[PDB]
């Protein structure tokens, strides 16, 4: 039951590296300052060119943030923001709206139960279909 | 809203009590570390080579 | 079943002892 | 003092068969010592030497033998038996069936390394369990009262709310220092989450420890799981003098792990293929209960078991019924009629009850009232069985009163809310509110003095 | 030759040992650096296989195995009575007092009978230097307890001419109190003798058993009686009363001493015995005294090592044969002879022998037989004549509650008394749960010669009681498919008196003071009244059903409802509060009241 | 009212979770402190190995201790290159002491084709001639083996004795 | 590399030069490469229970140990495939051999190589990026319904050293390389996982959302949750096809796995005939359900081990789709036929009977199988929930 210590810390350095890759995609310019501040603790470990082994032993040592229930919540908020901004790709949303949606998600109890996630999954269902669907009246 | 305010207050209290307990733990450690460290170092250095009691001839 | 399984095991042990006695 | 000598590690796995790894060339094998196995891929496993002969050591592997390799496996013989790193700090924590933590906390810093088997508590020093516990449940505190340190299992059919009853005992149990040790063997996560959640929700965590072996965890750990729980309970109840309540969940899954090991070792079968020694092995778990000389503490136990196919004569409930003092029974014949908790008093009995009741513990009527409730409930079942043949026209007016007793008894005496707590005294008042259905002269189990003081009240 | 061999291998309670050339079968050995007791169960060359009587967890290959030339044996002498011993005769009281711990430590070598205590010894006066002496001769009486004059006697294997005898005085278990010479060889005896438990202590003759073992319980004493010297089983499912009966014989019986063997029983059993027996009291010579002064406990609770169950049975019977040779009417309880048979199953399984049924070894029948045949009433060994006895009570605990079980089947073919406990009675809390259909006693023809003397009215009453109960079962099989309205009025009376007998005679509450014990005079008086009602009520119907003036069961119930209530009330009479004359007078008044009421219906 | 009960239950669960995480933070701090003690002992050993006098005495012990556990007639000792001159002397002293205590001859070799990792502070590992069985006498293994078993004494010193513990049962 | 056959007796083959073998490792025995599982080791020798018929195996035949226990080749190419219980592709065995039979000792790879699938690498990854077990390193657009999330094996981790560009690849082309502890792993799209080992997850969640079947009695009075465990009395008169087909034509599930645990030959072929012809509406199109199911079909005469492994293969496929964040459902058309196969294995291993002749471990084998159901947080970084719902029929 659960995970082996090697798996657990591997999943931690995974979510740290992934939060960083998400942050570089949501904000290539440092425009989302209040968001970026709420991840500075994890982002240092990926903005510095650490080896996977170095960040892993730092997670075992507790120097990296390492609670997966915390990292899953923190990562889910960023990813649900990134899925929003990517699912509307033809229209770059305003920076105040981005930091507002982030704050509303940060305040919500559980995003998978949220109507935010329902609306966003419907947006993706339409968008992903339209990336592939052939010319016909329905698709137009 | 009254539950959310009570949770924030309790969070501050348990963190304060945790930092107090961690201070007490750090004190007992620093008061005793040298003796413990020297005792482990004595036992680990004091090898005492022994044959298993069931060995014969 | 248990009795017959133990009999078959005892016969296997007798075969192994015979194979050692043939050395 | 500490074992200073350095551990040997053997690659000499001369065979593997079922769960057993047969080392050879071993230097002075210690029977039942623990070996740490390292598989070819570096996976750590653990195992106990179950037989020794000359250079050979038959290690049973806890995590199973899949992937063990006769050339690349390394077996580190620890030189000693299986020990639990016990401490006070095991309260407020959760561990898997092998005693490793699963609450994401650190390993236990041991205050002692107790042998997991314990030792036999000397029968001269075993204090007799006289003091009562109120469980808060009338079907218990009335007719099946539990003593402080008395081992008494819940027996249930499959799918019955026995976990909710055992949670209710943890929620409501108190005397007429305290702690809980919970163990579970082969529990589904849907139920493991229920117990962990109920303790966390009731805020009990600072005085409970959980050992969880989930349904998918390696079956051999079930054998050590209740022993880890009891070893922790012996530390808490004898070294720290707490009153500990130990809950052992599905001793049926423990007994299935015994049946698996015997089937794989080809040990002699008793009934239904269980080991011929099953009574001794269950006794090594169940006898680690009760008060002891010069200690304030006590180990109560409430084992829990799903009776296979509802069969009271099955070896699991039978051998448990021969060891434990009394059994609380829960029944589909109550649960299907929505009677919660479904406690069927008639097959039930608390052996230590005769001592845990009367003056200083409970009202003086309690010993008589209990026996008359059994007579009326039983005669009610007997006249119900008659009615199903001959109809209510053949029953006497008194037989109809035993049927009305059965209805009022199940509705008032047994049925009780999951958060409703009833005192023993309130339960006996309800006992008389039912016994008063009959004329005074019908109450053939009760003394005339007890009737004269309590029947008209 | 080396006095010790070495452990070759281990499998639970069974240890194989090399360098055992010249070890006897059933010789006792010490295994391991902790010197665990074990007994040689098999021999296989220069090698032996040992049933270890203590838990082998941690025994290692190459551990020393010390031989002894002794078989498994019990120290016998002063200081047995009131003590509690483990299955290998070590006193649990001194284990606690020495160790200062709640646990029994592995391998403790504590002497069975204490050697620091001085005992008051009175030599038998008639003996002197030059006198002839033989096995079982009582050469002195030790004043062990107020109840128990501990008759010291020569060991059965010993004989010779008295060379020294100690004067009256105080001595310990190592002090020489008697010295013999035989064939020019001297032999020194202290107050303690060692006996091999597997060997029966001899007797001059095994007499027929001809006096009841009166117990606490009505159904036992009346309807299925044990005899002093009789072999008895109590086969019963869990939670039936098998230990409550075992305790109730031990608390309340005419036995001079009790040996109580907690073989494989739950732990709190021994605690309940040690709680009750110092507080509970008999009376002798106008002095109140604690029944613990006449009881010995051989504990071996269910968690204590499986092998020690066998040694516990053989210890308790060896103690019982020792006090039998003193002329005491011993009673021996065995709290589960099937928990013993399960230990034979386990060692046999570790030895990989072929099983007979449910895994039990083929010799289980002979092991049980050579246990129960140690019972009897006997002309003891040696000079002064004695008529001691051992009565054995084996609380058989059949797996699943089913009497087809091999231990039950083998036991039933060996005992002469069978108190079968029915779980359906115990569920109803009808206690004692003795099933009167299946139960039997073979001793009735031998006991009729006692009842004809002391209780000449009883044998007709016993017979009528069994007949009324048998008729109730043969009636119930009809009623269950048609309803009670089918029966004749005589058969309603038969059913109702069988309910009186079931609920007020056969049923007996062993905790409440009125039924905590029930002397035979109370028992016969209760039964005489219930059967007096039957014969009068049956006569009343049979006398009047020939006429329009017909009596019926309902007529009797409405005219005599207070008599039915009074008949059921007879159990509440208390021998502590009420004198014998008072209970006899009340029961005579109910006979007269019934007679005048039935005379008023006719 | 059912929703208010759920709010009160959520508040209770949240306060319970706070107390659980607080307790665990303390327990993690204890484990880190015990880990720091064991690391400081590993560092003290990594200083002792610089003194060839004390370190030769350790190797004389650790090699003979290995021989007394294996008892085979042929053995292989494994060490770092930095240890080897000391280990050769330790084996040369141990073989006499071994033959005396065991009354039998032995052949012992040093594993010059397969030295220990340079990450090891010191000590030795010993094997059969067939390599199928080994004994581990690295200073890191010795320290973990003892420091694990001494952990009750360590906890009793670094946090004080438990006031509730009144019997050694 | 390979040992040699030393002895044979029915399905049991003893082999020598097996010194490097492992307990429950999987072996190809004989020149025909019959599949067999190592049931015992005794030194330089192994005892292999050969699954297939051993008639004609000879002393001194080669015995090639595969480095793996019984395991499922997971990857693209699962959807619409039909396998036997040991994961052999029955459609490819027919199409490659042009025989009506399954030949003894088929070597055919379970996900067909030489088929090229469109792979898109996950656009955020780069050389030097950190990655963990269960991370999605790309997507394969195999079907319109199901996009296969290619992911790092659960035990793998490290720093990416290479990633394949967007393009067409077969299952054995190297798609990702990564380094950990100075060792490189080269990853195919195929991923091999032991069939009796639970695939690990970040959290086993409480199950809370209904598996709508589109059936009034079921969805209202007796709802099964997504991630729920359920049973149906699979018998002749009962109409077990109604739930099976309703789940297929409507259910709130993304992927469906079936296991035939040893059905009767004709009844198995009825199921395999029907499902290609079943359809459901998707984005206003109507499409064959074979775009979102896989069939682990065995008849009663398949090797005993294929029937006993049938559920373990079906659940290992279902856990694989669960780890993509698909809400899997699966059925077993009779777990009693699986328990007969388990009984026969136990009888050939000569183990003690428990109840009604079944092995001692039947209860724990069932319970450890059903415990593999649930809702989960998957492994790896994209914060995806998934589930497996298990519909195991019973035949009392
Ligand atoms: N004669 C009796 N009077 C009253 N209660 C009894 C009597 N016999 C048995 N009981 C009740 O039945 C319970 C079970 O009987 P006991 O002998 O302890 O069980 P077992 O047969 O398993 O040894 C006792 O604890 C007691 O409560």
From TrEMBL, chain A:
Organism domain of life: Bacteria
Modification sites for N6,N6-dimethyllysine: 15, 119
Protein name in the entry: Uncharacterized protein
Source species of the chain: Legionella pneumophila subsp. pneumophila (strain Philadelphia 1 / ATCC 33152 / DSM 7513)
Record lineage: Bacteria, Pseudomonadati, Pseudomonadota, Gammaproteobacteria, Legionellales
Whole sequence portion shown: 11 to 150 of 573
UniProtKB/TrEMBL annotation, chain B:
Range of the intact protein held here: 60 to 116 of 118
Quaternary structure note: V-ATPase is a heteromultimeric enzyme made up of two complexes: the ATP-hydrolytic V1 complex and the proton translocation V0 complex. The V1 complex consists of three catalytic AB heterodimers that form a heterohexamer, three peripheral stalks each consisting of EG heterodimers, one central rotor including subunits D and F, and the regulatory subunits C and H. The proton translocation complex V0 consists of the proton transport subunit a, a ring of proteolipid subunits c9c'', rotary subunit d, subunits e and f, and the accessory subunits ATP6AP1/Ac45 and ATP6AP2/PRR.
Family label: Belongs to the V-ATPase G subunit family.
Domain of life of the source: Eukaryota
Name of the protein this chain belongs to: V-type proton ATPase subunit G
Gene: Atp6v1g1
Function: Subunit of the V1 complex of vacuolar(H+)-ATPase (V-ATPase), a multisubunit enzyme composed of a peripheral complex (V1) that hydrolyzes ATP and a membrane integral complex (V0) that translocates protons. V-ATPase is responsible for acidifying and maintaining the pH of intracellular compartments and in some cell types, is targeted to the plasma membrane, where it is responsible for acidifying the extracellular environment.
TrEMBL record, chain G:
Domain ATPase F1/V1/A1 complex alpha/beta subunit N-terminal span(s) in chain numbering: 6-67
Record keywords: ATP-binding, Cytoplasm, Hydrogen ion transport, Ion transport, Metal-binding, Nucleotide-binding, Translocase, Transport
Reaction(s) the record says it catalyses: ATP + H2O + 4 H(+)(in) = ADP + phosphate + 5 H(+)(out)
UniProt KW Transport keyword: yes
Top EC category: translocase
Superkingdom field: Eukaryota
Record-level Gene Ontology MF annotations: ATP binding; ATP hydrolysis activity; proton-transporting ATPase activity, rotational mechanism
Known EC number: 7.1.2.2
Annotated Mg(2+) 2 binding sites: 241, 263, 267, 333
Gene Ontology CC: one annotated term: proton-transporting V-type ATPase, V1 domain
Localization: Cytoplasmic vesicle, Clathrin-coated vesicle membrane
Every ATPase F1/V1/A1 complex alpha/beta subunit nucleotide-binding domain range: 214-396
Membrane topology: Peripheral membrane protein
Annotated ADP binding sites: 237-242, 264
Binding site for Mg(2+) 1: 241, 263
Protein's GO biological process: ATP metabolic process; homeostatic process
Residue ranges constituting the ATPsynthase alpha/beta subunit barrel-sandwich domain according to the UniProt record: 108-196
Subunit structure and binding partners: V-ATPase is a heteromultimeric enzyme made up of two complexes: the ATP-hydrolytic V1 complex and the proton translocation V0 complex. The V1 complex consists of three catalytic AB heterodimers that form a heterohexamer, three peripheral stalks each consisting of EG heterodimers, one central rotor including subunits D and F, and the regulatory subunits C and H. The proton translocation complex V0 consists of the proton transport subunit a, a ring of proteolipid subunits c9c'', rotary subunit d, subunits e and f, and the accessory subunits ATP6AP1/Ac45 and ATP6AP2/PRR.
Function (record text): Catalytic subunit of the V1 complex of vacuolar(H+)-ATPase (V-ATPase), a multisubunit enzyme composed of a peripheral complex (V1) that hydrolyzes ATP and a membrane integral complex (V0) that translocates protons. V-ATPase is responsible for acidifying and maintaining the pH of intracellular compartments and in some cell types, is targeted to the plasma membrane, where it is responsible for acidifying the extracellular environment.
Recorded family membership: Belongs to the ATPase alpha/beta chains family.
Full protein name: V-type proton ATPase catalytic subunit A
UniProt gene name: Atp6v1a
Location of this fragment in the whole protein: 47 to 442 of 647
């Amino acid at each position: 039951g659960g995970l082996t210590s090697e798996q657990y810390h591997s999943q931690v350095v995974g979510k740290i590296g992934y939060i960083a890759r998400c942050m570089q995609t949501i904000d290539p310019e440092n425009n989302l300052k209040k968001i970026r501040e709420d991840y500075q603790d994890v982002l240092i470990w990926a903005e510095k060119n650490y080896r996977f082994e170095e960040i892993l032993e730092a997670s075992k040592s507790g120097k990296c943030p390492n609670d997966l229930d915390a990292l899953s919540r923190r990562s889910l908020i960023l990813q649900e923001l990134l899925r929003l901004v990517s699912s509307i790709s033809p229209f770059k949303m305003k920076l105040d709206l981005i930091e507002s949606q982030y704050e509303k998600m940060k305040q919500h109890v559980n995003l998978w139960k949220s109507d935010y996630h329902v609306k966003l999954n419907q947006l993706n269902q339409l968008t992903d279909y339209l990336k592939n669907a052939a010319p016909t009246p329905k698709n137009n | 809203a009254a539950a959310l305010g009570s949770h924030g207050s309790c969070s501050s209290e348990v963190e304060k009590e945790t930092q107090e307990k961690m201070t007490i733990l750090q004190n007992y450690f620093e008061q005793n570390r040298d003796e413990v460290l020297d005792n482990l170092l004595a036992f680990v250095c004091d090898i005492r080579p022994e044959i298993h009691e069931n060995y014969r001839i | 079943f248990y009795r017959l399984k133990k009999i078959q095991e005892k016969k296997k042990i007798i075969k192994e002892k015979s194979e050692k006695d043939l050395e | 003092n500490y074992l200073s000598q350095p551990r040997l590690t053997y690659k000499t796995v001369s065979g593997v068969n079922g769960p057993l790894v047969i080392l050879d060339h071993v230097k002075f094998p210690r029977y039942a010592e623990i070996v740490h196995l390292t598989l070819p891929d570096g996976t750590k496993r653990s195992g106990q030497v179950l037989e020794v002969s000359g250079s050979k050591a038959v290690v049973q592997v806890f995590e199973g033998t899949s992937g063990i390799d006769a050339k690349k496996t390394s077996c580190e013989f620890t030189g000693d038996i299986l020990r639990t790193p016990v401490s006070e700090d095991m309260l407020g924590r959760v561990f898997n069936g092998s005693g490793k933590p699963i609450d994401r906390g650190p390993v236990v810093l041991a205050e002692d390394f107790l042998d997991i088997m314990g030792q036999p508590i000397n029968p001269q020093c075993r204090i007799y369990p006289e003091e009562m516990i109120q469980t808060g449940i009338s079907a218990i505190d009335g007719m099946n009262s539990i003593a402080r340190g008395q081992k008494i299992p819940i027996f249930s059919a499959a799918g019955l709310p026995h976990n909710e009853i055992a949670a209710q005992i943890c929620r409501q149990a108190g005397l007429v220092n305290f702690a809980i040790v919970f163990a579970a063997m082969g529990v589904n996560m849907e139920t493991a989450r229920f117990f962990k959640s109920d303790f966390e929700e009731n805020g009990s965590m600072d005085n409970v420890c959980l050992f969880l072996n989930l349904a998918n965890d390696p079956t051999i750990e079930r054998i050590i799981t209740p022993r880890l729980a009891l070893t922790t309970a012996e530390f808490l109840a004898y070294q720290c003098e707490k009153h500990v309540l130990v809950i052992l969940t599905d001793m049926s899954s423990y007994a299935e792990a015994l049946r698996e090991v015997s089937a794989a070792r080809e040990e002699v079968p008793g009934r239904r293929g269980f080991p011929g020694y099953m009574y001794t092995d269950l006794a090594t778990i169940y006898e680690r209960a009760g008060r002891v000389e010069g200690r304030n503490g006590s180990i109560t136990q409430i084992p829990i078991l799903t009776m296979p196919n509802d069969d009271i004569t099955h070896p699991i409930p039978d051998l448990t019924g021969y060891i434990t003092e009394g059994q609380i029974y829960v029944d589909r014949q109550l649960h299907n009629r929505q009677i919660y908790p479904p406690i069927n008093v008639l097959p039930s009995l608390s052996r230590l009850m005769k001592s845990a009741i009367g003056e200083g513990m409970t009202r003086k009527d309690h010993a008589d009232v209990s026996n008359q409730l059994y007579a009326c409930y039983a005669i009610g079942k007997d006249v119900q069985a008659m009615k199903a043949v001959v109809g209510e026209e053949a029953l006497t007016s008194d037989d109809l009163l035993y049927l009305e007793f059965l209805q009022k008894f199940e509705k008032n005496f047994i049925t009780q809310g999951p958060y409703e707590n009833r005192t023993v005294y309130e339960t006996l008042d309800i006992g008389w509110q039912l016994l008063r259905i009959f004329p005074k002269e019908m109450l053939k189990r009760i003394p005339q003095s007890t009737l004269s003081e309590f029947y008209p009240r | 030759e080396s006095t010790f061999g070495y452990v070759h291998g281990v499998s639970g309670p069974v240890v194989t040992a090399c360098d055992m050339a010249g070890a006897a079968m059933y010789e006792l050995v010490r295994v391991g650096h902790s010197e665990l007791v074990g007994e040689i169960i098999r021999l296989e060359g220069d090698m032996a296989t040992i049933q270890v009587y203590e838990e082998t967890s941690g025994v290692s290959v190459g551990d020393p195995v010390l031989r002894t030339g002794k078989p498994l044996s019990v120290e016998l002498g002063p200081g047995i009575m009131g003590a509690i011993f483990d299955g290998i005769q070590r006193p649990l009281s001194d284990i606690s007092s020495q160790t200062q711990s709640i646990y029994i430590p592995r391998g403790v070598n504590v002497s069975a009978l204490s050697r620091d205590i001085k005992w008051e010894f009175i030599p038998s006066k008639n003996l002197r230097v030059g006198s002839h002496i033989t096995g079982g001769d009582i050469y002195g009486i030790v004043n062990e307890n107020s109840l128990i004059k501990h008759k010291i006697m020569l060991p059965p294997r010993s004989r010779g001419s008295v060379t020294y005898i100690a004067p009256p005085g105080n001595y310990d278990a190592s002090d020489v109190v008697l010295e013999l010479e035989f064939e020019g060889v001297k032999e020194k005896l202290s107050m303690v003798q060692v006996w091999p438990v597997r060997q029966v202590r001899p007797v001059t003759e095994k007499l027929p058993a001809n006096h009841p073992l009166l117990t606490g319980q009505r159904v036992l004493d009346a309807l299925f009686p044990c005899v002093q010297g009789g072999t008895t089983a109590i086969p019963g499912a869990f939670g039936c009363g098998k230990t409550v009966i075992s305790q109730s014989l031990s608390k309340y019986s005419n036995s001079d001493v009790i040996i109580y063997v907690g073989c494989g029983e739950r732990g709190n059993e021994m605690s309940e015995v040690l709680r009750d027996f110092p507080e509970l009291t008999m009376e002798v010579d106008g002095k109140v005294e604690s029944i613990m002064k006449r009881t010995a406990l051989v504990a071996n609770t269910s968690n204590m090592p499986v092998a020690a169950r066998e040694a516990s049975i053989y210890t308790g019977i060896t103690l019982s044969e020792y006090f039998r040779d003193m002329g005491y009417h011993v009673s021996m309880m065995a709290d589960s002879t099937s928990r013993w048979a399960e230990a034979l199953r386990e060692i046999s399984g570790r030895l990989a022998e072929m099983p007979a049924d449910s895994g039990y070894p083929a010799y289980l029948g002979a092991r049980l037989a050579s246990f129960y045949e140690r019972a009897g009433r006997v002309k003891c060994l040696g000079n002064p004549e004695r008529e001691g006895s051992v009565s054995i009570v084996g609380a058989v605990s059949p797996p699943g509650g089913d009497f087809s079980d091999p231990v039950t089947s083998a036991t039933l073919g060996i005992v002469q008394v069978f108190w079968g406990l029915d779980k359906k009675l115990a569920q109803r809390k009808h206690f004692p749960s003795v099933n009167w259909l299946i139960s039997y006693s073979k001793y009735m023809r031998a006991l009729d010669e006692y009842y004809d003397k002391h209780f000449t009215e009883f044998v007709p009453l016993r017979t009528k009681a069994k007949e009324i109960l048998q008729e109730e079962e043969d009636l119930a099989e009809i009623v269950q498919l048609v309803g009670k309205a089918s029966l004749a009025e005589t058969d309603k009376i038969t059913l109702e008196v069988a309910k009186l007998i079931k609920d007020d005679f056969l049923q007996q509450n062993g905790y409440t003071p009125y039924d905590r014990f029930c002397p035979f005079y109370k028992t016969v008086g209760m039964l005489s009244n219930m059967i007096s009602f039957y014969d009068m009520a049956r006569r009343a119907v049979e006398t009047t059903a020939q006429s329009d003036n017909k009596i019926t069961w309902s007529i009797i119930r409405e005219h005599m409802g207070e008599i039915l209530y009074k008949l059921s009330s007879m159990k509440f009479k208390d021998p502590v509060k009420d004198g014998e004359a008072k209970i006899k007078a009340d029961y005579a008044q109910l006979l007269e009241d019934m007679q005048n009421a039935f005379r008023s219906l006719e | 009212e059912k929703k208010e009960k759920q709010i009160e239950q959520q508040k209770k669960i949240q306060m319970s979770n706070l107390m659980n995480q607080a307790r665990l933070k303390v327990l993690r701090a204890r484990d880190d402190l015990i880990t720091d003690l064991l690391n400081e002992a590993k560092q003290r050993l990594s200083k002792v190995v610089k003194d060839t006098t004390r370190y030769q005495v350790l190797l004389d012990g650790l090699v003979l201790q290995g021989l007394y556990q294996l008892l085979e007639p042929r053995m292989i000792v494994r060490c770092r290159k930095q240890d080897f001159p000391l280990v050769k002397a330790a084996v040369q002293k141990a073989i006499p002491m071994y033959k005396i205590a065991t009354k039998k001859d032995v052949d012992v070799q040093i594993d010059l084709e397969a030295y220990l990792p340079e990450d090891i502070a010191g000590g030795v590992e010993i094997y059969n001639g067939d390599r199928k069985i080994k004994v581990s006498n690295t200073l890191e293994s010795r320290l973990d083996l003892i420091a694990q078993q001494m952990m009750p004494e360590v906890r009793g010193a670094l946090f004080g004795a438990n006031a509730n513990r009144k019997f050694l049962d």
